[PDB]
Amino acid sequence: MMGMKETVSNIVTSQAEKGGVKHVYYVACGGSYAAFYPAKAFLEKEAKALTVGLYNSGEFINNPPVALGENAVVVVASHKGNTPETIKAAEIARQHGAPVIGLTWIMDSPLVAHCDYVETYTFGDGKDIAGEKTMKGLLSAVELLQQTEGYAHYDDFQDGVSKINRIVWRACEQVAERAQAFAQEYKDDKVIYTVASGAGYGAAYLQSICIFMEMQWIHSACIHSGEFFHGPFENTPFFFQFSEGNTRAVDERALNFLKKYGRRIEVVDAAALGLSTIKTTVIDYFNHSLFNNVYPVYNRALAEARYMWKVEY
Amino acid sequence: GMKETVSNIVTSQAEKGGVKHVYYVACGGSYAAFYPAKAFLEKEAKALTVGLYNSGEFINNPPVALGENAVVVVASHKGNTPETIKAAEIARQHGAPVIGLTWIMDSPLVAHCDYVETYTFGDGKDIAGEKTMKGLLSAVELLQQTEGYAHYDDFQDGVSKINRIVWRACEQVAERAQAFAQEYKDDKVIYTVASGAGYGAAYLQSICIFMEMQWIHSACIHSGEFFHGPFEITDANTPFFFQFSEGNTRAVDERALNFLKKYGRRIEVVDAAALGLSTIKTTVIDYFNHSLFNNVYPVYNRALAEAR
C-alpha cells in the first residue's frame, strides 16, 4: 500500500538538493537476505541510473562501499528488529548520511532507533501476501525506480500486487494432495537438491535451508538452472522450481536435461499454479512470493512423515 | 594491455555518453573467477555499476542498461561455450563493447568480441597474469579511466608481488598438505568457508571437492551466515576447509573460525596472514585473497588424490 510510496517521496524530496538518490543497498542476514533477492534482481534488470547492492550485514559493516553516503539509500530488514549486525548496518549508514529504511515486524524493536523510516509487513498464517516482507522489499525498489527515473511497468506491477494474495492461497490449496505424495517419496532421502533461476532464485535458496533444517544431515546445494545446459552430468533427487517469466526458458532446458538422465524431480510450476494472470512485464518478480509461500505445504507434509537451529525470518 | 583495451573503449564510447555499466558474464569456473572484480567495483566505484551474470541468465534476461554505455566482459577458457558466445553477440547487437578473456587466441569466441585478452594457465603460470587477475585488472582499469581510482599504484604494487607470494606459499604448505591428505581421504564431503572479495575461490574449491569426491555437491558457506542459523553442524561430522582471509573481512572470518572451534569441529585452516600476503598494502589486499587461495588449494587437492 501507500507507506513505501510516501517514505520514498520523503527521501526523494530530502536528497534532491544533494544530487538525488543514486545507490540502493539491501542489507540483512539470514532469511531476510534471501528475501531481498527479488529487489536486487528488479533493479539490475530495470534501472539505468540506480546501482543496487545486496549485502550480508557482516560484510556490509566491515567493508562498506565507498558510495555509501547522501546519494545512497539503505534498506535493512530484521524480523525481531534485534539483529546486532543489521542494527550496526543501519547505524553506519546514518553516520555516512544515507537515509535508512527498516523492515521489521516489531515497531518498538531496537532497530527502529537506528532508521529514518520504518515499514512493517504482514506475517504468519493467512497473511496478506501483498504486504509480506518480500513484497515490501520489492516495493521499495519499484518506488525508488519510479520516483527517480520512471518505471514503464509501474501499473502492471500494482496489478500484480493486487493479484498475488489470491493466487498464493489458492495455490496452497491446489498442492495439498501432491504434497502428500511428495512426502511419501522423499521422507527417506537424506539430501535433496533445489534448482531455480531468475528473480525467484532466493526462494529456492531458502527452500534448500528448510530442507537441511528437516534432514539435518548435509546442507544441500542450491543449483542454478543454467548449470544444466550441457553434459557431462557430473542418487540425490531434485526439487525443481519452474519459474514464469524471462528465465522460464532457462528452467525448461534444465528440466528437459534432468528428464533425459532419468532423475527424480519434484516439479513446482508457477505456470500451473495460477501465476500467469500477472502480466509478463512483471511476472518475474512474483515467483518468490509464490514459491516461498507454497513450499510450506510440502515442508509440513515432509515433516508429518517422520539440533534445533532457530532461523531468522 | 587491459590498459590499452580499456583506453580504446573509453575513446570509442565517449561520444555515446561514456562507460557507466560493467557486466561480467560467464559459466561455471569462469563465473566465480569474476567474483573479485564484482567485489572490487561494488566497494570502490561511485559512478560505475557492476553486474555478475550466468551466461544463460544474461542472454535470456538482459538488463535494460545493456547498451552503448555498458562494457561486457565474457570469459571462456576454450572460447567455445555457446551461451558465452551468444552473450557476446547480444551485447554487440546492443552496441556494448565486448572484451573476451580466453586461453585460446583463435577460439570461436574471439570472432564475437571487440577485444581479446589472454591469461596465463597451467602449472608454472605467472599469477600476475592469470584469469582472475585479468578480471580484476579490467575492473581496476575501467574504474581508473572513467572515475579515477585512489589506490591504483598500490594495486599495481600488489600485482608485482603476488606471483612470488603464491609460489612461496605453495612450497610453504607442501608438508602440512601431506598430513592433511591422510586425515581426509575417507570423507565423501568437506565444506568450504569464506567471505569478502575471495569468496569465489571457496565456491570453486567446493566444485573441486565435488570433482574429487563426487558424492554430494556441498554448500559453500559465507562466514557471516553461521550466527543466523541453521549452521552445518550435525551427526555427519563433515570436516571444514577454512579460508582465513586478510583485509577487511578477516574479522568476519575470525568470528566464524572461533564459532567452529566452540563446536570442536575438524578444520583445515589456510591463513593468508601466515602465507605472506601481508606484504601487499592494506588498501588493496582484499583483492588478492582469491589468487592466493585458488592456487594453494591445488597443493592440498593434489595430495588428496594421492592418498586414494
From TrEMBL, chain A:
Claim: Metal-binding is one of the keywords in the record: yes
Keyword Metal-binding included in the entry's annotation: yes
UniProt keyword list: Metal-binding
GO annotation (BP), single: fructose 6-phosphate metabolic process
Binding site for Mg(2+): E227, H230, P232
Domain SIS: 13-150
Matching CDD domains: SIS_1 (cd05710), SIS_GlmS_GlmD_2 (cd05009)
Pfam family, any one: SIS
GO molecular function annotations of the record: carbohydrate derivative binding; glutamine-fructose-6-phosphate transaminase (isomerizing) activity
UniProt-listed PANTHER family: FRUCTOSELYSINE 6-PHOSPHATE DEGLYCASE, GLUCOSAMINE--FRUCTOSE-6-PHOSPHATE AMINOTRANSFERASE, ISOMERIZING
The protein's name in its UniProt record: SIS domain protein
Lineage, highest ranks first: Bacteria, Pseudomonadati, Pseudomonadota, Gammaproteobacteria, Enterobacterales
